Amino acid sequence: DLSDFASSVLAEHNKKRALHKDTPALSWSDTLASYAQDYADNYDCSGTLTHSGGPYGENLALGYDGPAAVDAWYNEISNYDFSNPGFSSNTGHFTQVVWKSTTQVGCGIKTCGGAWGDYVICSYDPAGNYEGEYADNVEPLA
Template sequence: MKVLNLLRPLAFCAIVIGENLGAFKIDFKVLRGNDKRDLFLSDERPYIMKRDSSEMELQNRQTFYLANIKIGSNEDEVGVLVDTGSSDLWVMSHDLNCNRSSSSTSTQASPSSTSTMIASFGFEEDILNSHNEKRAIHGVQSLEWNETLVEYAADYAASSFSCDNVTLVHSNGPYGENLAAGYSGGYDPVDAWYDEIELYDFNSPGFNKSTGHFTQLVWKSTSQLGCARVICDNAWGQYTICEYSNTTGNVLGTNSETGLSYFAENVLKPLVNSIN
């Protein structure tokens, strides 16, 4: 989440959210509020934010709603401006305190160290679809989106990742996990993980650091997925973290009932009709 300088005395903040992202919850049961909309839009200054390296002016957006947004244990009624032409929701509030534990903004406030906890309707859909497209190549079940995993990923990213010092350190939590930095959107990081298939030996199945992302991605018995991302205002661009459960994947050892290693049972060769 990124605190923006709007050149005004009131404390404002701005975030981009989808329907939900981990600790972020938004409720649209409270609908349009014309009085607050008019007050919001009557300010002399337009609200300027950075979006995809271009400026975005929000003062005259066409669609305005009131909504309840909850970040952790804090809840506030906010104005929501829908960006026409995309599915992003730009949320502005006089009262919402952006500088809380879910924020990953650096205290140094330099461009290279600023990060934004960000989600949109597109990211979650894209990263789930990209996982399932790759898994379909191997004839294994599709994953389901799991909000518990999203919250875990978002919390770990917010507390442990720094755009100033980009290192991919696993949480060592109860779930399977894939990390990436420098890949944008929901498809690019998954493509990078899947490309490790070129190094995997299906005739000698097992774990290897050079193929661990791939085997995690296509693990047959895994059924749940949740991901989060951090956007860095530097060359790294995007940090992506995905969590996997039921089962975690990359399980060592042998199944006593079948006599096969868990890798042999869960990392399957591509289907013949999936190979170009």
């Protein structure tokens, strides 16, 4: 059985994906979550967000618990132009949350407290945000 962290974060992803046409639900991966939590264990609580360079897709946040980070990522839909699909600096988290071809997610968390609060990383497989593939993987609202 999943931890409370895993079940709450998975539900928050799949509540949002179900808003979109032809977009399957994700399942949780212990492999992805071990990778994510290992990286969080090593965060320096400095306030900067640097990507891991790994083999999986990746969303990062600072200042939110797990489900609250998912909500912030998904709210980027407000900036996304469905008639000009593609990457942008303030829609790249949203397009990975709903990426049609992604099938599994796993996440980790570390409590920095102080000025920064919680660090959250979610890892995804297959990865989203491939150039030339947005129109086929980022579907409109049902």
